[PDB]
Design a binder for this molecule. Sequence first.
Ligand code: MN
Length: 176
Amino acid sequence: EHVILLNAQGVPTGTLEKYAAHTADTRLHLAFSSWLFNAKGQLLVTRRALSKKAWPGVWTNSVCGHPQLGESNEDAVIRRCRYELGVEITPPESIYPDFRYRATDPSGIVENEVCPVFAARTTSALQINDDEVMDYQWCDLADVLHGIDATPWAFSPWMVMQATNREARKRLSAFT
Ligand SMILES: [Mn+2]
């Protein structure tokens, strides 16, 4: 696994090995986030495994990751959903294509990402990958947004930042 590097124009300049790109001085790179909803309209919230290098043991939106060379964003979502959660999904839909953030985790590991956001619905049962996900929950969207708004430090910084953008929250609500 690698990440795709980007300049200030969102133009790709190359590539680096996933683990090694993520340091105290992480260079701008490409990621994605998806918000997954079941047939009841509940959002899947997941807790990252204790073994993750960056934000281990942290609650977060359904699935995030790094698209690889030659793979669309959508296919990255679909593949990471099969890999982390053992689940099939409807075609990912853009909700926040221009999302970009920088943040620092309790060990000083920085994420610095152009991170388009998607929503999809699950169409099969979860089969949890314990190396990635230590816990999850199905929740009402409005409950999660109140949590995020009250105690943001309880969630990952990309989850919070995505959820707090007005256009993004409105599209996520409409999707449910
Ligand atoms: Mn990253």
